[PDB]
Amino acid sequence: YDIQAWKKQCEELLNLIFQCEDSEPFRQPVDLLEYPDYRDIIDTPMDFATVRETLEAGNYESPMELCKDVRLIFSNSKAYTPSKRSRIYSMSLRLSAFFEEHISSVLSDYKSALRFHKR
Numbered sequence: 001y002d003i004q005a006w007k008k009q010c011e012e013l014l015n016l017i018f019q020c021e022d023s024e025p026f027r028q029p030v031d032l033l034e035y036p037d038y039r040d041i042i043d044t045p046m047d048f049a050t051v052r053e054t055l056e057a058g059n060y061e062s063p064m065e066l067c068k069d070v071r072l073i074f075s076n077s078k079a080y081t082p083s084k085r086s087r088i089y090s091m092s093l094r095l096s097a098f099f100e101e102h103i104s105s106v107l108s109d110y111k112s113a114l115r116f117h118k119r
Protein backbone atom coordinates (compact mmCIF):
# COMPACT_ATOMS: atom_id res chain seq x y z
CA TYR A 1 0.00 0.00 0.00
CA ASP A 2 2.94 2.38 -0.67
CA ILE A 3 1.35 5.48 -2.39
CA GLN A 4 4.81 6.66 -3.60
CA ALA A 5 6.20 3.37 -5.00
CA TRP A 6 5.00 4.05 -8.55
CA LYS A 7 7.70 6.68 -9.13
CA LYS A 8 10.76 4.38 -8.87
CA GLN A 9 8.75 1.64 -10.69
CA CYS A 10 8.27 4.13 -13.56
CA GLU A 11 11.95 5.16 -13.51
CA GLU A 12 12.99 1.50 -13.86
CA LEU A 13 10.45 0.91 -16.65
CA LEU A 14 11.78 4.00 -18.51
CA ASN A 15 15.35 2.60 -18.13
CA LEU A 16 14.16 -0.69 -19.73
CA ILE A 17 12.42 1.25 -22.55
CA PHE A 18 15.65 3.20 -23.25
CA GLN A 19 17.60 -0.14 -23.52
CA CYS A 20 15.01 -1.44 -26.07
CA GLU A 21 16.16 -0.87 -29.63
CA ASP A 22 12.49 -0.25 -30.54
CA SER A 23 12.57 3.02 -28.51
CA GLU A 24 15.22 4.68 -30.75
CA PRO A 25 12.75 6.83 -32.79
CA PHE A 26 11.00 7.98 -29.59
CA ARG A 27 13.90 8.79 -27.22
CA GLN A 28 13.98 12.50 -28.11
CA PRO A 29 11.47 14.97 -29.66
CA VAL A 30 10.69 14.36 -33.38
CA ASP A 31 13.09 16.41 -35.54
CA LEU A 32 11.13 18.91 -37.59
CA LEU A 33 14.01 19.14 -40.10
CA GLU A 34 13.61 15.37 -40.81
CA TYR A 35 9.72 15.56 -40.80
CA PRO A 36 8.80 19.09 -41.95
CA ASP A 37 5.03 18.67 -41.85
CA TYR A 38 5.02 17.00 -38.38
CA ARG A 39 3.23 19.83 -36.54
CA ASP A 40 0.55 20.03 -39.29
CA ILE A 41 -0.65 16.59 -38.11
CA ILE A 42 0.55 16.34 -34.49
CA ASP A 43 -0.80 18.86 -31.95
CA THR A 44 1.12 17.61 -28.92
CA PRO A 45 4.57 16.13 -29.49
CA MET A 46 5.78 13.70 -26.82
CA ASP A 47 8.89 11.55 -26.38
CA PHE A 48 10.52 9.42 -23.65
CA ALA A 49 13.15 12.01 -22.64
CA THR A 50 10.35 14.51 -21.96
CA VAL A 51 8.46 11.85 -19.93
CA ARG A 52 11.61 11.02 -17.90
CA GLU A 53 12.36 14.73 -17.31
CA THR A 54 8.75 15.41 -16.20
CA LEU A 55 8.95 12.48 -13.75
CA GLU A 56 12.38 13.53 -12.41
CA ALA A 57 11.22 17.16 -11.97
CA GLY A 58 8.40 15.91 -9.68
CA ASN A 59 5.82 17.05 -12.24
CA TYR A 60 3.73 13.86 -12.35
CA GLU A 61 1.32 13.36 -9.44
CA SER A 62 0.37 9.80 -10.42
CA PRO A 63 1.37 6.96 -12.79
CA MET A 64 -1.90 7.59 -14.73
CA GLU A 65 -0.49 10.95 -15.84
CA LEU A 66 2.79 9.33 -16.96
CA CYS A 67 0.79 6.61 -18.77
CA LYS A 68 -1.25 9.27 -20.62
CA ASP A 69 1.98 10.91 -21.94
CA VAL A 70 3.54 7.53 -22.93
CA ARG A 71 0.32 6.59 -24.77
CA LEU A 72 0.50 9.98 -26.58
CA ILE A 73 3.96 8.95 -27.95
CA PHE A 74 2.30 5.91 -29.52
CA SER A 75 -0.86 7.67 -30.77
CA ASN A 76 1.34 10.38 -32.39
CA SER A 77 3.29 7.66 -34.24
CA LYS A 78 0.02 6.07 -35.40
CA ALA A 79 -1.37 9.42 -36.59
CA TYR A 80 1.86 10.37 -38.45
CA THR A 81 2.51 7.02 -40.13
CA PRO A 82 1.88 6.93 -43.90
CA SER A 83 1.24 3.17 -43.60
CA LYS A 84 0.46 0.53 -40.94
CA ARG A 85 3.52 -1.37 -42.28
CA SER A 86 6.02 1.51 -41.76
CA ARG A 87 9.20 0.73 -39.78
CA ILE A 88 8.84 3.41 -37.07
CA TYR A 89 5.13 2.66 -36.53
CA SER A 90 5.88 -1.09 -36.35
CA MET A 91 8.50 -0.36 -33.63
CA SER A 92 5.91 1.76 -31.77
CA LEU A 93 3.49 -1.20 -31.68
CA ARG A 94 6.04 -3.59 -30.12
CA LEU A 95 7.20 -0.95 -27.66
CA SER A 96 3.55 -0.21 -26.76
CA ALA A 97 2.90 -3.90 -26.05
CA PHE A 98 6.01 -4.03 -23.82
CA PHE A 99 5.00 -0.81 -21.99
CA GLU A 100 1.38 -1.96 -21.43
CA GLU A 101 2.55 -5.34 -20.11
CA HIS A 102 4.75 -3.60 -17.51
CA ILE A 103 2.66 -0.58 -16.52
CA SER A 104 -0.42 -2.66 -15.62
CA SER A 105 0.87 -3.68 -12.16
CA VAL A 106 2.19 -0.15 -11.49
CA LEU A 107 -1.29 1.30 -12.09
CA SER A 108 -3.09 -1.47 -10.18
CA ASP A 109 -0.78 -1.18 -7.12
CA TYR A 110 -1.05 2.61 -7.04
CA LYS A 111 -4.87 2.65 -7.33
CA SER A 112 -5.10 -0.08 -4.65
CA ALA A 113 -2.74 1.86 -2.32
CA LEU A 114 -4.78 5.00 -2.82
CA ARG A 115 -8.07 3.17 -2.08
CA PHE A 116 -6.43 1.81 1.12
CA HIS A 117 -5.30 5.32 2.08
CA LYS A 118 -8.82 6.68 1.69
CA ARG A 119 -10.58 3.67 3.35
Ligand SMILES: O=C(NC1CC1)c1ccc2c(c1)OCO2
Nearest residue numbers: 025030077080081082086088089
Ligand atom coordinates in the same frame (compact mmCIF):
# COMPACT_ATOMS: atom_id res chain seq x y z
O1 LIG B 1 6.40 8.82 -35.96
C1 LIG B 1 7.26 8.79 -36.83
N1 LIG B 1 8.47 9.35 -36.67
C2 LIG B 1 8.90 9.91 -35.39
C3 LIG B 1 9.28 8.98 -34.30
C4 LIG B 1 10.32 9.77 -35.00
C5 LIG B 1 7.04 8.07 -38.13
C6 LIG B 1 6.18 6.96 -38.23
C7 LIG B 1 6.14 6.19 -39.38
C8 LIG B 1 6.95 6.57 -40.44
C9 LIG B 1 7.77 7.67 -40.36
C10 LIG B 1 7.82 8.44 -39.22
O2 LIG B 1 8.49 7.81 -41.52
C11 LIG B 1 8.03 6.77 -42.39
O3 LIG B 1 7.10 5.96 -41.67
